[PDB]
Amino acid sequence: SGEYPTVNEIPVGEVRLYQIADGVWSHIATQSFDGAVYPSNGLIVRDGDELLLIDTAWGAKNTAALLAEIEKQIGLPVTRAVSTHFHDDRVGGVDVLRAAGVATYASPSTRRLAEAEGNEIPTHSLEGLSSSGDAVRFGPVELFYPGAAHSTDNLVVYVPSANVLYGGCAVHELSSTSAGNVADADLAEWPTSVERIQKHYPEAEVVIPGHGLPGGLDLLQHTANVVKAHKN
Ligand SMILES: C[C@H](OC(=O)c1ccc(CN2C(=O)c3ccccc3C2=O)cc1)c1cccc2c(-c3ccc(CN4CCOCC4)nc3)c(C(=O)O)[nH]c12
Ligand SMILES: [Zn+2]
Ligand SMILES: [Zn+2]
Known part of the structure; x- marks a missing residue:
């Protein structure tokens, strides 16, 4: 009923959308992994009379449900998708997307990692993102590689028309006490990468984490704090 939807409010297999700004929505789904249930976020950005999708809904059936929810709530076709890193909460569902006619994209680094890990593989490589601080335009968003x-391989996404910063899994929600799933992380570089985001997007008004509730710019400093304390 209007609040940001939480893990116990979304059965695995259902997807909810949340309006962030004009022409910007998040998508929220839940999935089981190693015997626990987790929420995750992605983004939808209006691209004229089409939509750009950022990240899958963490699985094939969730991603099919995402497409159905978009058709119900928005009614514009998803034509392109970008996955922001190689994990299943970002690429799981890419095969569903591709068979629905969506062109799927990721950095070459993400594509290599997804292939090596046995995850679904986006079709098209996003060049120009291999060095930290790199940025490229992609429809109505800017893609940024923070390190x-x-x-x-994690990318962040900025929507300039709305000053929305989608941090993906490099950014944690304010209630987070832990650095999340850090198995593929660089805890030493992570604060420096967050500092790059903070420097590049000082006008961000909404910050959306990979998992959990959106907030403001404080999510960036909070993330650096949590990662440093985890390493400590
Ligand atoms: C889907 C995602 O898989 C992973 O990451 C992940 C990593 C490493 C392997 C390990 N491997 C390999 O090397 C390998 C090589 C070859 C073949 C197969 C594999 C393989 O399987 C698996 C999977 C995920 C699965 C399950 C959970 C998560 C979380 C998460 C989010 C939030 C919290 C709770 N907090 C509150 C909010 O703030 C942070 C703390 N806790 C965890 C977050 C995230 O943080 O983004 N990603 C998660
Ligand atoms: Zn991840
Ligand atoms: Zn994640």
Whole structure:
């Protein structure tokens, strides 16, 4: 009923959308992994009379449910998708997307890591993102590579028309007491990568984490704090 939807509010297999700004939505789904249930976020950005999708809904059936929810709530076709790193909460569902006619994209680093790990593989490579601080335009968003953080390949996404910063899994929600799933992370570089985000997007008004509730710019400093304390 209007609040940001939480893990116990979304059965695994259902997807909810949340309006962030004009022409910007998050998508929220839940998935089981190693015997626990987790929420995750992605982004939808209006691209004229089409939509750009950022990240899958963490699985094939969730991603099919995402497409159905978009058709119900928005009614514009998803034509392109970008996955922000190689983990299943970002690429799981890419095969569903591709068979639905969506062109799928990721950095070459993400594509290599996904292939090596046995995850679904986006079709098209996003060049121009291999050095920290790199940025490229992609429809109505800017893609930014901040450096290694949650993963070595993690990208962030900025929507300039709305000053929305989608941090993906490099950014944690304010209630987080832990650095999340850090198995592929660089804890030493992560604060430096967050500092790059902070420097590049000082006008961000909404910050969306990979998992959990959106907030403001404080999510960035909070993330650096949590990662440093985890390493400590
Ligand atoms: C889907 C994602 O898989 C992973 O990451 C992950 C990593 C490493 C392997 C390990 N491997 C390999 O090397 C390998 C090589 C070859 C073949 C197969 C594999 C393989 O399987 C698996 C999977 C995920 C699965 C399950 C959970 C998560 C979380 C998460 C989010 C939030 C919290 C709770 N907090 C509150 C909010 O703030 C942070 C703390 N806790 C965890 C977050 C995230 O943090 O983004 N990603 C998660
Ligand atoms: Zn991840
Ligand atoms: Zn994640």
